[PDB]
Each structure stands twice: as C-alpha cells, then as structure tokens.
Design a protein around this ligand. Structure first.
Ligand code: GTP
Ligand code: GTP
Ligand code: GTP
Ligand code: 5GP
Ligand code: 5GP
Ligand code: 5GP
Lengths: 474, 474, 474
C-alpha cells in the first residue's frame, strides 16, 4: 500500500493507528462499486464468518451465504453434522429466507428458544405444511412455557407467493403490525420468509452461489490426524472452500497438512493460517495453499497476546502478508481484530481479498450460541474461543493437555436491541466498505487496494469522530 | 373453641391477632400424634393444595398425595387434561417418587426447563427404559441449550431396586455427591427416584390412598353451565373428592349446583365454598355438601378485600364456620390466608378438618408455573389468581366481562434456595402442626380442636419471636 | 347499618378497620344490579368527582358525566370560565367521546401536551372539519416540538359514522394497531371518538342526563361574599347540582349560606358540607340543604388532621351522618379518604347515596393538572388541595391570610402505565361496588345499605389479601 509522505512510524500499526485519506473519486452512489472478491472464494461481499464454534453455524451460514458472504464450518465436528449443515445450507432458496418452523404439537419453550434464533422476531407455525400463523415474543411472554403452540398462533400475518416482487412486499409490510411476511409455494406450502428489511436487501445483495447455483459454504480442519482423509471426506459432502486453521500457521505440521490437501487435487481453493509474516505467507503459498489467513493475536478471544509476547498489530501484518501473497499470485484474509466496520475497510485496503470476522458476529441471533439476557436484561450472547482446537494434539489424557492449553475465554457480546441480526451488521460493514471505496474513488476491490492512500494517527487521532451506538460493534 | 378468660375482643381476629396457650400434655414425641383428617377426604396430613391454576398441577398433585395430602384439580380445564392428570397421579408408586425422565434425543433446553420441575435437583436420562445417568444444573450451565442430552449425561449415580429399605438408601446417599438416587425395577427398568430426604420422609409420612390403593386426587368445577354433567364426567374419570369452588359461596346458584351434584349420588364427598358465615355454612350443608370451604377474602391473591369491603378475618370466620358445620355433622376447610405454618395450626385448632393452601405452595418446584429468576437472580415463580374463573358466567363478549372481572393479580413468590421443594414446606407445616398438638397435648386432630385454648394478642404481640428465614414463607 | 354480634369497638373506624360479610344472594351477574343514586343528583353510578381544582375540569367533567357520574366545578373560578365549561360539557355527545382536535397549523408541542389530556393515547388532526389522521406519542417523540403538526399526521386510522353499533367498532379495532377510531358525522365532519374500551363501556354504562338530555354537571361556591348571587349566577348558566363546600360545615356562616341559596327556590338539589356529626348533618338538613357532605379530615390532601386534632375516621362519620340524614329524608356523600374501591363500597354500604372522590382521580389523564414524568420517568401528576378556598375570607392582605392558612399540600399521584384513564378507575370502582352488591345480594343501592352486614377487623386483618397493582390506587 501507499502511505502519506513522512509517515514512517517506528512501530507496527493496528487498525486504530492508521486511517485512509480520500482521493480522486468519479463514482457517486455506493451501489456503483462492486464488492466481489477475486480470491476464488466466490463471495460477492468481503465478509467471511470465522471458524469459531460460537460464530459459525447452520443459521449463520445460510444467512451470510444468502447475502453474498461465506461461512467456514468449525473444525473438529462430526462428519455427519457438517454434512447435514451443508445439505441444509445448499437446500435453501437464494432469495427468500427460511423462518422458524413450529408445529402446534411443539411446546411454548421450543418457540421462545427459537424466536431469537433468527432476526425475524416472529416464528411461523405450520400445520401439514400450511402456515397458519405467526408466534412473536409478546405472545409467549405471558403463557406457560410448556403449553401447546396452537394456543399462541395468531392469524394476522401477510402471505405472498414465491417470485413476488419485493416492491409489493415492502408496501404490504408497510402497514402490517408485524415485520414478518410468510412466503408460500404456488401449492400453498411454506417456502420461506421475506422480511421487509430482507425484501429491501434482496435487491441490494447477490448471493454467493456454487457451480450448481446453491449457497456456498466452507469447512475447516486442524493439522492433527489424517488431514488428507478429513479434507477428502469434507470434499465428498458439499463444500465450496477448504480452510486449514491453526493457532500457529508457520509450523512444519502446517506445511505437511497443506501439502497433503494439495496432493489430493480436490480443486477446491485452499486456505491456511495463521501467519503474520511475509516469510510465513510465502511458505504457505509454496506449500500449495491458495489463500493465507493472516491474523494471529488480534483475535478478540485470542489470549495468545496476553499469555505470550507472540502476536502482531493486525493492520501491518495484513499489509505485509498481502504484499507477500500478491508477489506470488496468492490471496490473504484478515483474521480477528474486527470490532468496527473501519476494521473491515482498513484490512481490505491493506490488500486482503476479504475479511474473516469472528466474535463480533457471535453477538447476533443467527450465531449458534443461545441468546442470554444479562443482569440489566439486555440481549447478549456468551461468545467463546476455539482454544485447544487451534493447537496440535481417557480423562487423565484430557486433563494433561487442558491444564496447559489456553483457557476458553468468554466475553459478554451484547446485541443491539434494534439491529440485532447478522444481516444488520452485514449492512453496516457493506455500507462502510462502499463508503471507503467511494471516498477513495475505486469502483472495485483490487482498485480499492491499488488507489488507497493511508496515514498514521495517534491515540488522540482515534478519539475524534462519533463512537458507535450500543450493540453495533463489539 | 375456648378463649382465655377476659379475651372478648370487639373485632374479628385473623391469624396474627390470635395465639394458642399450652395445656395438659402427656405425649412427648411429635410422631406420637396422628394428623389423619376425619372429613372423609382421606388425607393423613391436614395439608390440601388450593384450586389455583398456579398451584395445582400433575407434579404437585402426585407429590402432595404421596406425602399424605390431596390436591384439587383447577376448575375450567378440559376433561381430557384432568383425566390424563388423574391417570398419571394414580399410576405412580406410593413410596418412590418419579424423576424427570429425558431421552438422549431430547434437547438441553428440555432438560434445563425440567430440572426445576422437581425438587430432586437432578433429572434422570433413560435409554430404552434403562437409566444411564443423571443431569444436574451444573452440567447444563455451560452447554448450548440445544445440544443432545447425551452430551450431558454423567454416569456417577446411585442405583437401588424397588423395595429397598430407606435405611440403606440413606447411607448410600451419605457419601454420594448427588442427592438423587435412581430406583430401578427388578428387570432394570426405571421405576422412580428416592431422594435422601425423601427416603427419610418415606418412614414418616403415609400416602393418602383410595379404595384401590392409588394416590388420591380431587377435582373442581364452577357453578356455570351444567354442573351436574361436569361433576359426572369428573366422576367417570378417576376422582377422590369433588370441590365446588366459587368466589361467592352464599349464592342461589351455589345451592342449585350443590343440589345438582348431590342428586347424582356419586358417593364422592362434596366440598363447597366459600362462606365466612355460620348461616352460609349451614345453608351449604343443608344443600347437600359434606364439606364447606370457608375463606373468602384472606386469599393472598384475592383482591376482593381491596376491590370491596367484602371479606372477613380468616381465623374468626373459620371458628364460626367450624362451629356451624359441627352442629350439623359437616366439616370445613380454611381457604387462603396461609402464609406461615402458624396459620395452618391456628386454622386447624379453630375447627377446620384440614387446611387449603394456595399461593404459598406455588413458590415451589412442583407448582405448574415455570420457575423464573429475578433481577437479583433468586429463584421465584409468578403466582396468579383464578380471578373470573371463581365467578359466574366472541372477543367482544370476552372484553365485556374481562373489563369488569377482577384483574389477575400476580405476586413474586420467592423460593427458599435450600428448601425449595413442596415436600420441604410440607415438612415445615407438619412439624408445626405436630408441635401445636404436643404443646396442647392432643394426640389427634379432633382432640386438637377440643383441647386447644386460644388467646388474643396485639400487633406488638405478633412482633415477638423470630421471623422465618427467606423463602420458607410467603 | 348492622354490625356483627359482639363487634362494639371503643374507637371510631375508618375504611381499613371495617369490612363487609356476605349474605343472602340471589343475583348472579354484576350487571343485574343498578347503581343509580336516589339523592336527586341523577348519577347512574355512585362516583362523584371532588371539588378540587386539581381534579375537577372540563375533560373530567365530560368524561365522568358520560359514564354516569357527576363532577362538581371547583369553587372560586370566574363565572365566564365555569359557564364555558358547562356549555362545552352539555354540548358533547352522550355516547361518543370527543378526541383531542388539532389543526395542522398547530405546533408539535401543542400536540405532545394534549395527547395526555385524554386516555385515548392518540390525538386526531382535522382539516376544515375533516379528520385526516391521528397523532400518537411515538410519532412526536423524535420530532422537534415546534414543527407543524402536518409533519406528524399518519393516515392509518379507522373511520366509522355516528350511530354505528359498538359491536362492529370493537372488531374494527381488534386488528387496528391504534386503539383509537375516528367517529364522523354523516356529512364527514368529525363528531367524536370511540375507543375500543370505550366502545365496550358504551353498552355497560348509561350517561347521567338532565331534563333536556345533556350531560349533568355540578358547580360549587364558598360561604364568603354574596352566596345567593353566586348561586343564582351559576343557576342562570347551565347547572345540574349546587354544592356549598367549606372546610368547616358546622358554622353559622354555613347555615346562613344554605338559607340564602334555599330562599332563591332555584329547584336545584342543594349539597353542603362538611360535618362528621349527626348534629351537624341534621342542622344542615334543617337549614334547607338536601344533601350533606360528610368527610372533613380524611381528605388525602387535607392537613387538618395533622395541623389539628380536628377530624374523624371516615367510615364511622359516614355511618352517623347517613343515619342522621335518613332520619330527615336527606342524603349524604362520603368526602375524602377514597384510596381504594373498597373505600367506595364501604362508604356506600355505610349509607352514603354516592361517593365524592378527590386526589385519586387527579392522577389521571382527564384531570385538569398537566401530566409530569418523575425521576424514574413514570407518569404522574402533582395533585394539590383547595387550602384557603375552603375557608372563610393588596399583597399585604394576601400575605396576612396566607401566612396562617394551611399550606397547599402536594402529593405525587402516580398513574398506572396501562390503565391511566379516569374511565379505567371508574371501571375498577364500578366493578368493586357491583361485587359488593352481589356478595351482599342487593339488587339496588338502598338495598345495599339495608342488607349489608359489617364487621370490625384489626390492622393485621387489613394485611390479608392482595394489594393493588401500581397506579390503580393512590
Ligand atoms: N421446530 C423447529 N425445530 C427447529 C428449528 N430449527 C432448529 N430446530 C431444532 O433445534 C435444534 C437446534 O437448532 P440449530 O440452530 O440447528 O442448532 P444450534 O446448535 O443452536 O445452532 P447451529 O450451529 O445453527 O446448528 C435442531 O437440531 C432442531 O432439532 C425450527 O425452525 N423449528
Ligand atoms: N422428557 C420429558 N418430558 C416431560 C417430563 N414431564 C413432563 N414432560 C413434558 O412437558 C410437558 C409439561 O410438563 P407438565 O409438568 O405436565 O406441565 P405443566 O403445565 O408445566 O405442569 P402440570 O400442571 O403438572 O401439568 C408435558 O406435557 C410433557 O410433554 C419428563 O419427565 N420428561
Ligand atoms: N388544538 C386544541 N386545543 C385544545 C384542545 N383542548 C383544549 N385546547 C386548548 O388548550 C387549553 C387548555 O385545555 P383545557 O383542558 O380546557 O384546560 P386545563 O386547564 O388543562 O383543563 P380543564 O380544567 O379541563 O379546562 C384550552 O383553553 C384550549 O385553548 C384540543 O382538543 N385541541
Ligand atoms: N488462539 C486463538 N485464536 C482464536 C480463538 N478464538 C478465536 N480465535 C481467532 O480469532 C478470530 C476471531 O477474532 P474476532 O474477529 O472475533 O476478533 C478467529 O477467526 C480465530 O482466528 C481462541 O480460543 N484461540
Ligand atoms: N376471589 C379470588 N380468590 C382467589 C383468587 N386466587 C386464589 N383465590 C383464593 O385464595 C386461595 C389461596 O390463598 P392462599 O392460600 O394463597 O393465601 C384459593 O384457594 C382461593 O380460595 C382470585 O383470583 N380471586
Ligand atoms: N381542608 C381541606 N380539605 C381538602 C383540601 N383538598 C381537598 N380537600 C377535601 O378532600 C376531598 C378529597 O379527598 P380524597 O378523595 O382525594 O381523599 C375533597 O373533596 C375535599 O373535601 C384542602 O386543601 N384542605
């Protein structure tokens, strides 16, 4: 990248210490620029969900892939579970979202636990495939948590067939007291759900599709065991991207695993990490990987920076690894340290093909973790790190390792009471990246890398401006 | 009853204004006295659970009937639901309690919502009828609320066949880290659960059984509609006692309903209410009822005392109605106003055959209401009154009545963190009644009525002594 | 009245110390009993709004008279103001309520200050008489308080002509997101507003009408000055009842004023007060008054009980004055001390023709005082007493009296966040009185006096039962 004249700091910079100065801009609207990545991951937006078990899940995978991102399935899960997740994700529609389906035979608790699994805010109830009503939080607040759901269904809900123009759906939901509309198949069976905000998004975003036209999804494995067999098994079942993720990516085991996956000629683009050095990035590229994950240490749940002096400020690491990868035709991802949309924009301008986002997304409805309400009754979720799952390999055997593996750190990730959905932070991040592109004047992401000019700011320089409202950022 | 010389107050007395003075006592241990009632309800202890939908339920019915009480099924429930409740209650064992059964296919939320449905504190998991482990609160605290239960089962649990002496079970649970022991059938199938405290109680209490030997249960109906048909339907399905419960028991509709049930010659003893007058009690006895419920107004959720000057201090009402009923060979129950075991003892000495307890029991695990945790994270349940269900009889039709029916009052009934089970308040109440009998010197409940001497105390006289600890009383 | 045998207390009783015991009841539904008073005031419900400047006003007068009560215009107001109030009150419709009318030329502050002047919760906007939309609190929360109202009008509102059956209106508002429906004249001009709850009430209550068919209203004067001229002036302008109200009603000036008004032969029934003695009541009856107000001292803002030993427990005073008035064919009103509906029921059973309610009603939208929000942001109003206006008669002249007149006491009267309207407390009071009548078994108010049986309870006897929720009672 290009820095301002005289900006040659003697220290490595994180996101807070570096900024972007505007430049020659010819575009006007932020919809003119495109966010499609060129790394081969196929994402039309530069957002990638991390490999954390508290962030990556079925609902988040489907939701993010619908809006143009990709989600990496967490490492160390049964092959059956990840295969089922992939089948569900690629079985969903490209445009209409799937609501929370409940049969009247279910219990009220089965509703109250699922209304917050999606950003819709109101689950749907189906009877032999026919959607007969909606179930909201206000309906289940006063009822026993184990009465039949049929006691809670309300018949005031908007219906529309699949293929309906979102323009009409928006006006239908304009006067509807509930922001949820049921989309039904031409035979009347429930096909999905189209939120008013989701209806608006349907014309803005474009889903990341595979060669068949289904939602893209990524899977991950560790370096322990037969990495080749695990990668081949994940390839058999649906998979659009392979990510080899470890706490330390500059290991001999890392290179051996990359070589093992590359020798299988699966055709899937290969992603590895993490290294915060040009030497590590070029070594991983040479080993056969197509993409190199960068961040080790800036992870919001990563205690390596505190257990050990090992780490690096994220921005400088991304810049160096991006230069190293582009010298060899590879690509890199920024991993961790993503608290604000400015982090996404800064990492993308630093040369990353896209940005891998972790615990920030875990504080949303679509995250696999269950929603909790704190002492002050604010929506939040307890996000936790991968810990030993990123490291190399009886109860005594478990205790021998777990005594010295870094503890599973947990942070209270609060949701924004209004924009609590993952699509809402996707909107924030996409708006930020588009604003950065317009300010720079670049119409596409490689142009965003090429034309950006960066500068160094002090701690007080980070203080100016307006901070984010509650819940929009970690 | 007999009052002290010169104690002729000019005001009606509640429980707080009256006390018991000791007398000639020949018994020493409180196990020497028996608490069996003579009203025909068959309860070996004078505790009866109220007819409130927040107190009476399947679990409370079974638990209280096991320890010698009886529970009245709430009025205005479907015939199928009450029939299923009765079948379950009479299908359970007389000695061993039933634990919370979970299959490994269930979700973690289905456990976490049920561990607090019983006072055991740890649910059991069954696989094809074989109990394979226990599930406690500490196990489910850190796991996602929708993983399979099999991920939570712990194999450290005590096993013992049915018919095992509780003496051995107590010593088995002496060193067991979990206070829950699994009782299994001779073929290995799960038959029930025997808590250490429950094991101790098994030798103290004696269950209230019917003519067949199954747990007794009572059902209730209102005065609206075909009361005779409803009573006959409740008689067809298992039922050990019929309670006609209304907000006002001195009505012509009340007498007509009593006559209708009496003309059916069901044989079941008939209970009616509520009247706080001797004239009302004798009228209800003449109408055909065998038992008259007394309290109207002292109910902890009854807002009639505040909506209207209508009401009465509970103790004087119980004394007068007891005298009226005993003049005619009938029996009476104290209804409402039961906050402390002293209330039970005072009502029983006042002449009531047994005591009908309401919202105090609703603050327990066995109550049908779901357990909630307050702002300070203390276990409590939101108990609510019957409201319009105790009164005589489209959405407009519902709004016409509900606008003027008394609102469903709700109170924050806190559980005691240690003795939160309904059996624990049963132990407190039974210990109090036995202590009252020993202090009076009576070996049986009619002797408790006959030999008791009461006195009147001021508000300051209620201040002396030690108040109950948190959660033991409402 | 009749007390229980042995209930002969040595102290005068307030509402809290006395209760009602049920009796022979033949009626079942509380709509069977009628609440019409026989004192000649014409009120179909026993609720009368006090003479306090913080309670009696145009909106409260119209609202209470619509539901069957009467409101006494405060003493010491200009003749023009009370004449305008009377003309407005008698100019309104008997069934449909009038909403808050706003022209688009008005300011947003003129809306935000008026949305809380009525219990509707959403004002109406008219353009040349045509209602073009509604204005709610949520609409004005985010806008500058001085933009034009036209920027706030929302067109989603239900319309219905006058004479429409409330059955259809209820179903129309069933799915409407706003609880406010606009009632329009057959030519399209705005005629009033029919709230869903108001639509239900329209079939329950019956308005108190004059000989012409317009809403009844009462006016009040002091004893100072030419009381005859003031009464004649109030008679010229519309008036349905004359109330001579003073702090001390057993004065020679009181008798002289009563004689002066009686000599005018206005025909309007005459009400005077206040005396808490049989001698005072009979003296005021002899002086020419038809009704005697009783309470002096129990007033929630009356500091006479604290400045002076002068006063009386309200219930005993009402009983004695009721007996004194009925010995002479007169009638009495309970004045002050009305915190709960039980107070209304107890005073009515004590023999009062109806109940005069004060600061309890001032904590409502319809009260003339402006709504305030406290430190915790809870809706409340600062109710204040009449102070020197109830007593007999330059800045020095003002300071000479005001230094020794009792200070204007002020209390923080909180509204219930849900049922904050005066019609809602009217519903509570009417439901309480009807419940008392049904428990007693009386079908009409003189029968409620005749058939009621009362008893004395201690302070602990007042503790039993459930307290009111927040905001329902003072
Ligand atoms: N009735 C009903 N059950 C559902 C629905 N979605 C999920 N479930 C059930 O709830 C379980 C947990 O839901 P998931 O969201 O898949 O699980 P999770 O661990 O919370 O999150 P993921 O990582 O997305 O799997 C599923 O295995 C189903 O048994 C729904 O819409 N309706
Ligand atoms: N797996 C499992 N499900 C249970 C168990 N007990 C109850 N359930 C289920 O949970 C539902 C609610 O339990 P109940 O306690 O009967 O219902 P409630 O309304 O909370 O209380 P009750 O008044 O006692 O019925 C039942 O209808 C069953 O479907 C148990 O031990 N194991
Ligand atoms: N635009 C508009 N102005 C109103 C409305 N009602 C009252 N006002 C104006 O606001 C003033 C105060 O309203 P009122 O409620 O009559 O006065 P108050 O002193 O608050 O209470 P009252 O004792 O009922 O008179 C009136 O004199 C009118 O000028 C309304 O519906 N629309
Ligand atoms: N070493 C380590 N890294 C973690 C852990 N949990 C998450 N990470 C890293 O941090 C990233 C997410 O960081 P975030 O975007 O939440 O700031 C993950 O993609 C992963 O690279 C953990 O427990 N240990
Ligand atoms: N009028 C009335 N009585 C109630 C209500 N809920 C409970 N009760 C009465 O109060 C009794 C329980 O009182 P507790 O024992 O909780 O003080 C019940 O058995 C019933 O008689 C209600 O909503 N209204
Ligand atoms: N002496 C006196 N009585 C007052 C004052 N304000 C109200 N009152 C009395 O108290 C009554 C209202 O009492 P409430 O119904 O609010 O308890 C009024 O109708 C009036 O009789 C005041 O300032 N002084």
């Amino acid at each position: 990248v290009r820095f301002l004249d005289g900006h040659t700091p003697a220290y490595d910079l994180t996101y807070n210490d570096v900024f972007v100065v505007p430049g020659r801009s010819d575009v006007a609207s932020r919809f003119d620029v495109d966010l499609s990545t060129v790394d081969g991951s196929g994402t039309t937006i530069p957002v990638v969900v991390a490999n954390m078990t508290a962030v990556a899940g079925r609902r988040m995978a489907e939701t993010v892939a619908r809006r143009g991102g990709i989600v990496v399935l967490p490492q160390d899960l049964p092959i059956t579970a990840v295969s089922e997740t992939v089948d569900f994700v690629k079985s969903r529609d490209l445009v209409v979202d799937t609501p929370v389906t409940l049969s009247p035979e279910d219990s009220v608790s089965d509703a109250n636990a699922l209304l917050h699994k999606r950003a819709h805010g109101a689950a749907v109830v189906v009877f032999e495939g026919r959607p007969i009503g909606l179930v909201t939080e206000a309906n289940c607040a006063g009822v026993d948590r184990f009465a039949r759901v049929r006691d809670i269904a309300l018949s005031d809900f908007v219906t529309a067939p699949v293929g309906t123009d979102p323009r009409e759906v928006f006006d239908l939901l304009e006067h509807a007291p509930i922001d949820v509309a049921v989309m039904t198949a031409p035979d009347g069976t429930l096909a999905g759900v189209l939120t008013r905000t989701g209806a608006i998004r349907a014309g803005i975003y474009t889903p990341a599709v595979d060669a068949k036209g289904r939602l893209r999804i990524a899977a991950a494995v560790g370096i322990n065991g037969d990495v080749g067999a695990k990668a081949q098994a994940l390839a058999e079942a649906g998979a659009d991207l392979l990510v080899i993720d470890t706490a330390h990516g500059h290991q001999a085991k890392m290179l051996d695993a990359i070589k093992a996956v590359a020798s299988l000629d699966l055709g899937l683009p290969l992603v590895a990490g993490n290294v915060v050095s040009a030497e590590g990035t070029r070594d991983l590229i040479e080993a056969g990987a197509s993409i190199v994950k960068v961040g080790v240490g800036p992870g919001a749940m990563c205690t390596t920076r505190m257990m050990t002096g090992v780490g690096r400020p994220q921005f400088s690491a991304v810049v160096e690894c991006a230069a190293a990868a582009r010298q060899l035709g590879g690509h890199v991802w920024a991993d961790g340290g993503v608290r604000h949309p400015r982090d996404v924009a800064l990492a993308l301008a630093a040369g990353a093909s896209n940005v891998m986002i972790g615990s920030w997304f875990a504080g949303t409805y679509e995250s696999p973790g269950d929603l909790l309400f704190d002492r002050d009754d604010r929506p939040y979720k307890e996000s936790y790190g991968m810990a030993s799952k990123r490291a190399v390999a009886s109860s005594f055997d478990r205790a021998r390792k777990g005594l010295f593996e870094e503890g599973i750190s947990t942070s209270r990730m609060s949701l924004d009471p209004a924009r609590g959905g993952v699509e809402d932070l996707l909107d924030h991040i996409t708006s930020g990246v588009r604003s950065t592109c317009t300010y720079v004047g670049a119409a596409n992401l490689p142009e965003l890398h090429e034309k950006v000019v960066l500068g160094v700011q002090s701690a007080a320089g980070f203080a100016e401006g307006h901070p984010l409202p509650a819940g929009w950022t970690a």
